[PDB]
Amino acid sequence: GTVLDHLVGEETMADYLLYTLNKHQRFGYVQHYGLGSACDNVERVLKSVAVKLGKTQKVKVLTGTGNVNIIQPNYPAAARDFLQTFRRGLLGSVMLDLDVLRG
Amino acid sequence: ERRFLSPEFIPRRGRTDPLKFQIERKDMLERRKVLHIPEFYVGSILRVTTADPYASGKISQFLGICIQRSGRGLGATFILRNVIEGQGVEICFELYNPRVQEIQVVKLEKRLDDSLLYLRDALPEYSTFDVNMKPVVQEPNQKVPVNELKVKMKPKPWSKRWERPNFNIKGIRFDLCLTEQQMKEAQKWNQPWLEFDMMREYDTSKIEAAIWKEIEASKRS
Amino acid sequence: APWSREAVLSLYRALLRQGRQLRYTDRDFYFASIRREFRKNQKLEDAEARERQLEKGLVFLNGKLGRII
Amino acid sequence: GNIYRTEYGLKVWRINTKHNIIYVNGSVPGHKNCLVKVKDSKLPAYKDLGKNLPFPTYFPDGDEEELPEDLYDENVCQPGAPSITFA
Amino acid sequence: AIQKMTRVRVVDNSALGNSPYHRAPRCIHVYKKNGVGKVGDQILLAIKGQKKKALIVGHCMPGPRMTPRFDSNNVVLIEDNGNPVGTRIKTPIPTSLRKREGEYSKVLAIAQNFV
Amino acid sequence: LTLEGIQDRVLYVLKLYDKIDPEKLSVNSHFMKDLGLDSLDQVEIIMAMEDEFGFEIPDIDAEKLMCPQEIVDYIADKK
Amino acid sequence: KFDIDMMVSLLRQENARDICVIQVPPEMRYTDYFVIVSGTSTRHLHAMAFYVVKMYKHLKCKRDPHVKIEGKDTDDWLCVDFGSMVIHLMLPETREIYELEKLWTLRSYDDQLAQIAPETVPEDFI
Ligand SMILES: *P(=O)(O)OCC(C)(C)[C@@H](O)C(=O)NCCC(=O)NCCSC(=O)CCCCCCCCC
Numbered sequence A: 001g002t003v004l005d006h007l008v009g010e011e012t013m014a015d016y017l018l019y020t021l022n023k024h025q026r027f028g029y030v031q032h033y034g035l036g037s038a039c040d041n042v043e044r045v046l047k048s049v050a051v052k053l054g055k056t057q058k059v060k061v062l063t064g065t066g067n068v069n070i071i072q073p074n075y076p077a078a079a080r081d082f083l084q085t086f087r088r089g090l091l092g093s094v095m096l097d098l099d100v101l102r103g
Numbered sequence B: 001e002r003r004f005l006s007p008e009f010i011p012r013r014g015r016t017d018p019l020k021f022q023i024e025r026k027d028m029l030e031r032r033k034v035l036h037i038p039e040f041y042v043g044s045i046l047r048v049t050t051a052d053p054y055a056s057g058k059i060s061q062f063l064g065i066c067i068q069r070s071g072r073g074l075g076a077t078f079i080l081r082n083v084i085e086g087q088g089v090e091i092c093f094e095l096y097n098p099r100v101q102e103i104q105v106v107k108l109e110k111r112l113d114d115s116l117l118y119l120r121d122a123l124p125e126y127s128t129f130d131v132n133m134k135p136v137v138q139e140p141n142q143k144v145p146v147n148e149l150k151v152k153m154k155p156k157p158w159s160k161r162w163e164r165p166n167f168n169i170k171g172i173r174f175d176l177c178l179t180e181q182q183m184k185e186a187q188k189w190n191q192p193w194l195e196f197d198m199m200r201e202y203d204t205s206k207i208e209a210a211i212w213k214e215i216e217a218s219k220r221s
Numbered sequence C: 001a002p003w004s005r006e007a008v009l010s011l012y013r014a015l016l017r018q019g020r021q022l023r024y025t026d027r028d029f030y031f032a033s034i035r036r037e038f039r040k041n042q043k044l045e046d047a048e049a050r051e052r053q054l055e056k057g058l059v060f061l062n063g064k065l066g067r068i069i
Numbered sequence D: 001g002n003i004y005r006t007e008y009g010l011k012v013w014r015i016n017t018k019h020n021i022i023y024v025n026g027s028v029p030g031h032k033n034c035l036v037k038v039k040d041s042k043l044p045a046y047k048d049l050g051k052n053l054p055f056p057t058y059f060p061d062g063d064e065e066e067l068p069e070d071l072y073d074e075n076v077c078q079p080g081a082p083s084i085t086f087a
Numbered sequence E: 001a002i003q004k005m006t007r008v009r010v011v012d013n014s015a016l017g018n019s020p021y022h023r024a025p026r027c028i029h030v031y032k033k034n035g036v037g038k039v040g041d042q043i044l045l046a047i048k049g050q051k052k053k054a055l056i057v058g059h060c061m062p063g064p065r066m067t068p069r070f071d072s073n074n075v076v077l078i079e080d081n082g083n084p085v086g087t088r089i090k091t092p093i094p095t096s097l098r099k100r101e102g103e104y105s106k107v108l109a110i111a112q113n114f115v
Numbered sequence F: 001l002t003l004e005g006i007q008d009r010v011l012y013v014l015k016l017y018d019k020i021d022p023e024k025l026s027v028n029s030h031f032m033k034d035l036g037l038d039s040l041d042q043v044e045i046i047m048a049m050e051d052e053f054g055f056e057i058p059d060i061d062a063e064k065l066m067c068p069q070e071i072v073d074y075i076a077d078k079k
Numbered sequence G: 001k002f003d004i005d006m007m008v009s010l011l012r013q014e015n016a017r018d019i020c021v022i023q024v025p026p027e028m029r030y031t032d033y034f035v036i037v038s039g040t041s042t043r044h045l046h047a048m049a050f051y052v053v054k055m056y057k058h059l060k061c062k063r064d065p066h067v068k069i070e071g072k073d074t075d076d077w078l079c080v081d082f083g084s085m086v087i088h089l090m091l092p093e094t095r096e097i098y099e100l101e102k103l104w105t106l107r108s109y110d111d112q113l114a115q116i117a118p119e120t121v122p123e124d125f126i
């Protein structure tokens, strides 16, 4: 949280923080969000989070027939909540410099 | 006994010298006798064969539904729209461009609206047509069929506010896409005095007769 | 699994008939390309995709969309 | 507006002999049915090009032959000509 | 037609161009003096946190006569030197890239449909 | 023609092959187990000999050749 | 006369491996003959590229416009497009990555073309 999350994109560190949790094998998000099992697909994890909290957003998608407004799970809202939960500490202790410490 | 005149032969209202129109029509009749231009309206299915200048003059084909017949003079044009592979395309062909090899009316039909520009916001299958569909036969001495199809529209927003009275569209199921309050709100732009404004109607009856005399005189010569 | 085994071998040698009649391209690469193409598309066990490979092989023999000479 | 302006480097694609009409390339200043003064181009690259042009002018009465109805350009495709097929 | 901060549709089968969130990349720079992109011009895309150059093949803005008009703005990704990122093109593309001066034979070879 | 000149040409064009191992080359060389040849391999070697020895052999019989003895037999009685 | 017969012969002395010539039907609206050439090193394709264009300019055809080399900065891929013949000089590793032979013989029947998913028009959620 030392820098603003919006200028990097909430999706890129949602996967990165998910990546670090898998590396530490903590899997604290599995029971927190009621997920079936640990997963690595970032989009599918955010889909479950949006499903869990009932967050939906309508977006414009570029199709071959033109622009279509469809309602989709609110991935940015899911990413922001998922990032906030980790920062609050509900996902357990983390260490981002373990790899550089070992060499 | 039904006779049909191509829309571009009737000049727009203005101060242009009629002598220019006479010379423009002479070029049309000289060009028309070489390349036959079949009669068609907006909504008909047209297959146009042209030559691509930068592909070694290879023969080109394109099939689509006519949605607009605008322009006047030798610059008259029509727009064919089709969805190929799932992506919609539009081409504004030129009637008198010598690049055109032949024009074939696959299906001659009329729609409830003069212009089909609202098909862009309509559902994709209302504009998708088979590229190699077999042309259907037209019975001689038969009235031009009129299609009463009311297309279904994609959710708002649209490219243009088709429900407003100025567009005057009668080929859209508005009740399946717009609520009653939205229709009433669009009614505020209605102008009931336009239809009764006698000074803005263009009387072409005296003009079409002159055009027909010129057309038949050239053919006899 | 395919339409018929005899058709598959019949088209394979039919391709070699065309390859023997070719003039411009390289016979060594043409022979090598067709054999390795068959080596990977077989032993699929799906019994339906191999039928799709049959029809695309059939149009290759006809060469109405593209002919290599 | 309402001032005199001149456009340079306009070529003649077609000439109609019967109606005395010149087909100049591009647009010209002035509205419709306005009187425009026309003369030979003064551009340096277009000097010494009146060798074959009529001098001092064309005299149809004294001409030995009758001009065609329309004088076209070599690059201009005639309306009656068959449709162009590119090479 | 296409300028800075304009969403575009990627047509080739490049893995980069496939968005799992259905999010369309937007152009951040147009490689022209006036900053306006017509069919066949080269632009820059900021896609998935990467600044990848792209080539535009179709736009919704109308063009000259007898030129096909697409209802969506289509782009194809290319490398920093000219090679395409994706392997093949599925959506139809204009044939005007032959006449235009530039590196268009690579995309035309991998293209499938002509309109 | 000479009957001897048939068999020696048949085995020579078989020895020209690279992937297969010329371990046992008799008139009864069964390719399924000795050489491990599939339908494609058995078809291809027929083209490997037809190009230099043949031009009158269709598919209706080439699918059931199975041994070098009978191309000698099939060539001999065809001529 | 500059045609495929001389084009293939001009490519023989350049040690051009895996020469492929495909007759393109007029319905494809691209060209008449499509040529694929494999090389060994980046200098080799450049050597072939300069050799073919030098003969093309020198030999005949003053009327038609000149041809520029396409892909000079691209080391792996290089191409040159004449009036009716186009050649794509690329490394064999690029040939496997960019498979071009089947696409110009099978239209929309290619393995990769059959691999891609069709238009879906994403639907609404719940
Ligand atoms: P044999 O009887 O032992 O063979 C039986 C085998 C092959 C083992 C079958 O059981 C099998 O595994 N597959 C049967 C056929 C199959 O799987 N696919 C059909 C092949 S058709 C094909 O590949 C299309 C050919 C197109 C040619 C393209 C070449 C391009 C060169 C430039």
Ligand SMILES: [Mg+2]
Residues within 6 Å of the ligand: B159
């Ligand atoms: Mg708009």
